[PDB]
Design an enzyme around this catalytic site. Structure first.
Site, PDB file in Angstrom:
ATOM      1  N   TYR A 234       1.461  -2.775  10.689  1.00 34.48           N
ATOM      2  CA  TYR A 234       1.092  -2.960   9.295  1.00 34.48           C
ATOM      3  C   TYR A 234       2.107  -2.287   8.360  1.00 34.48           C
ATOM      4  CZ  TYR A 234      -1.634  -2.666   4.943  1.00 34.48           C
ATOM      5  OH  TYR A 234      -2.050  -2.641   3.633  1.00 34.48           O
ATOM      6  N   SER A 235       2.437  -0.985   8.594  1.00 34.03           N
ATOM      7  CA  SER A 235       3.449  -0.238   7.830  1.00 34.03           C
ATOM      8  C   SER A 235       4.753  -1.035   7.812  1.00 34.03           C
ATOM      9  CB  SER A 235       3.714   1.131   8.452  1.00 34.03           C
ATOM     10  OG  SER A 235       2.851   2.165   8.001  1.00 34.03           O
ATOM     11  N   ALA A 236       5.209  -1.509   9.003  1.00 35.15           N
ATOM     12  CA  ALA A 236       6.441  -2.275   9.185  1.00 35.15           C
ATOM     13  C   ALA A 236       6.502  -3.461   8.242  1.00 35.15           C
ATOM     14  CB  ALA A 236       6.572  -2.729  10.628  1.00 35.15           C
ATOM     15  N   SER A 237       5.438  -4.292   8.221  1.00 32.88           N
ATOM     16  CA  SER A 237       5.341  -5.462   7.344  1.00 32.88           C
ATOM     17  C   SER A 237       5.412  -5.108   5.859  1.00 32.88           C
ATOM     18  CB  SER A 237       4.102  -6.284   7.669  1.00 32.88           C
ATOM     19  OG  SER A 237       2.903  -5.641   7.280  1.00 32.88           O
TER      20      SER A 237
ATOM     21  N   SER B 245       0.833  -1.194   0.000  1.00 40.19           N
ATOM     22  CA  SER B 245       0.000   0.000   0.000  1.00 40.19           C
ATOM     23  C   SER B 245       0.864   1.238   0.000  1.00 40.19           C
ATOM     24  CB  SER B 245      -0.961   0.001   1.183  1.00 40.19           C
ATOM     25  OG  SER B 245      -0.283   0.106   2.419  1.00 40.19           O
TER      26      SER B 245
ATOM     27  N   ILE C  56      -8.939   1.285  -1.266  1.00 40.67           N
ATOM     28  CA  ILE C  56      -9.737   0.460  -2.179  1.00 40.67           C
ATOM     29  C   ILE C  56     -11.068   0.166  -1.460  1.00 40.67           C
ATOM     30  CG2 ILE C  56      -9.668  -1.720  -3.584  1.00 40.67           C
ATOM     31  CD1 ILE C  56      -7.467   0.648  -4.275  1.00 40.67           C
TER      32      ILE C  56
HETATM   33  N1  LIG Z   1      -8.590  -2.683   0.958  1.00 38.63           N
HETATM   34  C1  LIG Z   1      -7.858  -1.567   0.851  1.00 38.63           C
HETATM   35  O1  LIG Z   1      -8.357  -0.437   0.942  1.00 38.63           O
HETATM   36  C2  LIG Z   1      -6.375  -1.704   0.626  1.00 38.63           C
HETATM   37  C3  LIG Z   1      -5.625  -0.552   0.408  1.00 38.63           C
HETATM   38  C4  LIG Z   1      -4.275  -0.638   0.100  1.00 38.63           C
HETATM   39  C5  LIG Z   1      -3.655  -1.880   0.026  1.00 38.63           C
HETATM   40  N2  LIG Z   1      -4.354  -3.006   0.266  1.00 38.63           N
HETATM   41  C6  LIG Z   1      -3.675  -4.384   0.200  1.00 38.63           C
HETATM   42  O2  LIG Z   1      -4.475  -5.211  -0.602  1.00 38.63           O
HETATM   43  C7  LIG Z   1      -4.402  -6.599  -0.201  1.00 38.63           C
HETATM   44  C8  LIG Z   1      -5.787  -7.208  -0.182  1.00 38.63           C
HETATM   45  O3  LIG Z   1      -6.659  -6.489   0.715  1.00 38.63           O
HETATM   46  P1  LIG Z   1      -8.244  -6.705   0.693  1.00 38.63           P
HETATM   47  O4  LIG Z   1      -8.874  -5.371   0.589  1.00 38.63           O
HETATM   48  O5  LIG Z   1      -8.619  -7.759  -0.278  1.00 38.63           O
HETATM   49  O6  LIG Z   1      -8.496  -7.240   2.178  1.00 38.63           O
HETATM   50  P2  LIG Z   1      -9.530  -8.322   2.739  1.00 38.63           P
HETATM   51  O7  LIG Z   1     -10.915  -8.219   2.211  1.00 38.63           O
HETATM   52  O8  LIG Z   1      -9.424  -8.290   4.273  1.00 38.63           O
HETATM   53  O9  LIG Z   1      -8.833  -9.690   2.285  1.00 38.63           O
HETATM   54  C9  LIG Z   1      -7.875 -10.437   3.070  1.00 38.63           C
HETATM   55  C10 LIG Z   1      -7.823 -11.843   2.531  1.00 38.63           C
HETATM   56  O10 LIG Z   1      -6.781 -12.596   3.200  1.00 38.63           O
HETATM   57  C11 LIG Z   1      -7.336 -13.733   3.835  1.00 38.63           C
HETATM   58  N3  LIG Z   1      -6.640 -13.947   5.101  1.00 38.63           N
HETATM   59  C12 LIG Z   1      -6.802 -13.230   6.259  1.00 38.63           C
HETATM   60  N4  LIG Z   1      -6.121 -13.695   7.277  1.00 38.63           N
HETATM   61  C13 LIG Z   1      -5.456 -14.793   6.754  1.00 38.63           C
HETATM   62  C14 LIG Z   1      -4.596 -15.749   7.335  1.00 38.63           C
HETATM   63  N5  LIG Z   1      -4.294 -15.781   8.637  1.00 38.63           N
HETATM   64  N6  LIG Z   1      -4.115 -16.728   6.534  1.00 38.63           N
HETATM   65  C15 LIG Z   1      -4.489 -16.754   5.250  1.00 38.63           C
HETATM   66  N7  LIG Z   1      -5.294 -15.911   4.595  1.00 38.63           N
HETATM   67  C16 LIG Z   1      -5.754 -14.952   5.409  1.00 38.63           C
HETATM   68  C17 LIG Z   1      -8.828 -13.440   3.976  1.00 38.63           C
HETATM   69  O11 LIG Z   1      -9.643 -14.627   4.073  1.00 38.63           O
HETATM   70  P3  LIG Z   1      -9.968 -15.356   5.458  1.00 38.63           P
HETATM   71  O12 LIG Z   1     -10.472 -14.287   6.460  1.00 38.63           O
HETATM   72  O13 LIG Z   1     -11.127 -16.293   5.099  1.00 38.63           O
HETATM   73  O14 LIG Z   1      -8.767 -16.061   5.902  1.00 38.63           O
HETATM   74  C18 LIG Z   1      -9.112 -12.647   2.708  1.00 38.63           C
HETATM   75  O15 LIG Z   1      -9.362 -13.522   1.612  1.00 38.63           O
HETATM   76  C19 LIG Z   1      -3.630  -6.605   1.115  1.00 38.63           C
HETATM   77  O16 LIG Z   1      -2.280  -7.029   0.937  1.00 38.63           O
HETATM   78  C20 LIG Z   1      -3.725  -5.142   1.551  1.00 38.63           C
HETATM   79  O17 LIG Z   1      -2.560  -4.757   2.267  1.00 38.63           O
HETATM   80  C21 LIG Z   1      -5.731  -2.928   0.570  1.00 38.63           C
HETATM   81  O1  LIG Z   2      -3.470  -0.076   3.223  1.00 41.51           O
HETATM   82  C1  LIG Z   2      -4.409   0.702   3.262  1.00 41.51           C
HETATM   83  C2  LIG Z   2      -5.777   0.203   3.666  1.00 41.51           C
HETATM   84  C3  LIG Z   2      -5.969  -0.089   5.187  1.00 41.51           C
HETATM   85  C4  LIG Z   2      -5.802   1.341   5.800  1.00 41.51           C
HETATM   86  C5  LIG Z   2      -6.810   2.294   5.648  1.00 41.51           C
HETATM   87  C6  LIG Z   2      -6.613   3.606   6.044  1.00 41.51           C
HETATM   88  C7  LIG Z   2      -5.429   3.985   6.633  1.00 41.51           C
HETATM   89  C8  LIG Z   2      -4.429   3.056   6.811  1.00 41.51           C
HETATM   90  C9  LIG Z   2      -4.608   1.748   6.396  1.00 41.51           C
HETATM   91  C10 LIG Z   2      -7.368  -0.706   5.488  1.00 41.51           C
HETATM   92  C11 LIG Z   2      -7.546  -0.945   6.992  1.00 41.51           C
HETATM   93  C12 LIG Z   2      -6.492  -1.932   7.506  1.00 41.51           C
HETATM   94  C13 LIG Z   2      -5.104  -1.361   7.223  1.00 41.51           C
HETATM   95  C14 LIG Z   2      -4.929  -1.123   5.714  1.00 41.51           C
HETATM   96  C15 LIG Z   2      -5.088  -2.469   4.996  1.00 41.51           C
HETATM   97  C16 LIG Z   2      -6.476  -3.049   5.274  1.00 41.51           C
HETATM   98  C17 LIG Z   2      -7.536  -2.062   4.783  1.00 41.51           C
HETATM   99  C18 LIG Z   2      -6.638  -3.267   6.778  1.00 41.51           C
HETATM  100  O2  LIG Z   2      -7.888  -3.879   7.082  1.00 41.51           O
HETATM  101  N1  LIG Z   2      -4.267   1.993   2.897  1.00 41.51           N
HETATM  102  C19 LIG Z   2      -5.172   3.118   2.655  1.00 41.51           C
HETATM  103  C20 LIG Z   2      -3.946   4.040   2.757  1.00 41.51           C
HETATM  104  O3  LIG Z   2      -3.731   4.805   1.576  1.00 41.51           O
HETATM  105  C21 LIG Z   2      -3.053   2.777   2.675  1.00 41.51           C
END
Ligand SMILES: NC(=O)c1ccc[n+]([C@@H]2O[C@H](COP(=O)([O-])OP(=O)(O)OC[C@H]3O[C@@H](n4cnc5c(N)ncnc54)[C@H](OP(=O)(O)O)[C@@H]3O)[C@@H](O)[C@H]2O)c1
Ligand SMILES: O=C(C[C@]1(c2ccccc2)[C@H]2C[C@H]3C[C@@H]1C[C@@H](C2)[C@@H]3O)N1CC(O)C1
Ligand SMILES: NC(=O)c1ccc[n+]([C@@H]2O[C@H](COP(=O)([O-])OP(=O)(O)OC[C@H]3O[C@@H](n4cnc5c(N)ncnc54)[C@H](OP(=O)(O)O)[C@@H]3O)[C@@H](O)[C@H]2O)c1
Ligand SMILES: O=C(C[C@]1(c2ccccc2)[C@H]2C[C@H]3C[C@@H]1C[C@@H](C2)[C@@H]3O)N1CC(O)C1
Lengths: 265, 265
Positions: A159-162, A146, A194
């Site tokens: 989260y940032s760290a990872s 992200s 997203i």
């Molecule tokens: N959503 C955003 O706004 C956003 C913004 C920036 C970046 N991202 C990045 O986008 C990626 C996808 O995010 P997303 O929005 O799709 O989030 P999400 O809806 O929470 O999806 C997380 C997925 O990972 C699985 N998961 C969770 N814990 C797990 C575990 N212990 N072992 C294996 N699988 C596990 C979940 O299924 P289960 O719960 O069934 O295990 C789910 O399929 C992430 O890497 C996130 O950092 C997201």
């Molecule tokens: O990475 C993400 C989305 C998340 C978030 C949302 C606002 C602020 C920080 C983190 C959402 C809330 C937490 C932390 C992280 C990943 C997912 C979705 C998690 O459930 N962003 C948006 C920013 O631009 C980078």
């Protein structure tokens, strides 16, 4: 080069965190493109549902393996079973993350340990376990990050760290692969907010910011990875790549190689 | 604002990895400044030797606690024993790292877990364990990093990861501290190649670059931390801070706060 959905026709692709969110949207997109897909998450039920719509959409083959990426042995085993199931691997999408709530860091060492194990370590285990098949297929790795993996925001310290740890690790691997003339590409996907249900629930009552569509995000990830781009930026603002781009780092990284004993690679 | 060695007269300071290298040079510098010091590393023998020269140099008090930062319980316990021993804490210098050799990454997963536990996790455990004393004293934290924690180089993938992980974690904490009006400063020290015997031995037959003096490095670290600077760059090139500075990130980080509910602080 310009992308063509035919680039993924018959290709063997793994997607982590595919039960919901971006992972799911990527599965569906790969399906419509005629690719062989293998999905994972913890929910067996959740995976079944998307694996059904996957074939229904046009997937060359669709399978699932339920489990927790908290377990490093599962992460390594999932990759091998999936590799067997598809008879190789072309693209590895590293998407899954452990649950994170937005709160100012107080303590919880074990929560930070979980974060680094799930969000970071499993990714290295899985990429190490997949690299030979990827070497054969001259394939790619999509590392989902992200803006918070390029910059800092409050309430997401572990989260940032990872996400920063991934940048360090995988950008190094990318350079190593290049210098050892191995044609396996590493695509770091830097994403903004997203509109996934999970994020929306987590920012409710904390962040005001406008989200971006999970369908267009997922497609952009597949597009960039296939087009073998080193980094892919996807956010509401068009200035995010200019601001987070870090050309200075790119320059620095290039000249660093000059100091190396060429016999090393 | 300009540094005066009187800024550290009678101040209670912790130094990790103090048996040798930069840690040792920092101990000696603090001693000459008239500060209370508590040192740590694995070698009891090594620590004794520097703790002797510490008092000999002018240290207000000098003590040591031997142990491995691989053990998270020790990391928190060391901080409490040290806090008792000095009757508080003004400055916490996070310097120690697990052994790293320059080699292109293969499959040493347990070594990556080791690097992340020592180089990253212990730092979060120790900073969490120290934060109340630091809150009372309106003190500082010195997080020792490298150029490899801001940019990528081959043969140091797990090391880069740990240093990038620190950037993400501590820069977040710094912002959180600031927004919650807590006057505890976090100084990230980005360093280039240093004159330490350990580094010199590790680059032999791999990197031919000019090292910088460990004495001037250590002093610059103390100087910057005391002057409460957010980040401190110490490298042969004068362009390293302009190139690695990331003003775009700084811009992005500021505007991010705009989207937050201010009452959450
Ligand atoms: N959503 C955003 O706004 C956003 C913004 C920036 C970046 N991202 C990045 O986008 C990626 C996808 O995010 P997303 O929005 O799709 O989030 P999400 O809806 O929470 O999806 C997380 C997925 O990972 C699985 N998961 C969770 N814990 C797990 C575990 N212990 N072992 C294996 N699988 C596990 C979940 O299924 P289960 O719960 O069934 O295990 C789910 O399929 C992430 O890497 C996130 O950092 C997201
Ligand atoms: O990475 C993400 C989305 C998340 C978030 C949302 C606002 C602020 C920080 C983190 C959402 C809330 C937490 C932390 C992280 C990943 C997912 C979705 C998690 O459930 N962003 C948006 C920013 O631009 C980078
Ligand atoms: N040296 C350079 O060129 C250079 C360049 C850029 C950045 N840096 C950064 O500078 C810092 C200091 O480096 P240095 O040059 O002083 O290295 P060094 O000489 O190797 O010092 C490492 C110190 O940490 C201790 N240590 C090692 N393993 C430990 C463990 N398991 N638990 C607890 N303590 C442990 C060592 O003592 P024991 O072996 O007795 O435990 C020693 O005192 C590091 O954070 C490094 O990343 C160094
Ligand atoms: O961080 C360091 C110094 C080290 C290094 C030395 C050349 C290349 C990469 C890493 C030394 C060798 C390993 C890894 C790391 C930390 C120490 C000393 C460790 O023993 N640098 C110098 C570069 O600008 C950032």
């Amino acid at each position: 080069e310009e992308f063509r959905p035919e680039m993924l026709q018959g290709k063997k692709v793994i997607v982590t965190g595919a039960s919901k969110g971006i992972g799911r949207e990527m599965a569906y997109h790969l399906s419509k493109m005629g690719a062989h897909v293998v999905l994972t998450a913890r929910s067996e039920e959740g995976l079944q549902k998307v694996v059904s719509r996957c074939l229904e959409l046009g997937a060359a083959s669709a399978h699932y393996i339920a489990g927790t990426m908290e377990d490093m042995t599962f992460a390594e085993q999932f990759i091998v079973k999936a590799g067997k199931l598809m008879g190789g691997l072309d693209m590895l999408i590293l998407n899954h993350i452990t649950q994170t709530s937005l709160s100012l860091f107080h303590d919880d060492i074990h929560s930070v340990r979980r974060v680094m194990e799930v969000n970071f370590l499993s990714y290295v285990v899985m990429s190490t376990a997949a690299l030979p098949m990827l070497k054969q297929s001259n394939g790619s790795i999509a590392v989902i990050s992200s803006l918070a993996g390029k910059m800092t925001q409050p309430m997401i310290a572990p989260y940032s760290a990872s996400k920063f740890a991934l940048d360090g690790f995988f950008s190094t691997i990318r350079t190593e692969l290049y210098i050892t003339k191995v044609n396996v590409s590493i695509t770091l996907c830097v994403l903004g907010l997203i509109d996934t249900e999970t994020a929306m629930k987590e920012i409710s009552g904390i962040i005001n910011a406008q989200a971006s569509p999970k369908e267009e995000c997922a497609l952009e990830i597949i597009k960039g990875t296939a087009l073998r781009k080193s980094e892919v930026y996807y956010d509401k603002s068009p200035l995010t790549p200019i601001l987070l781009g870090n050309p200075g780092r790119k320059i620095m990284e290039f000249f660093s190689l000059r100091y190396y004993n060429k016999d090393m690679f």
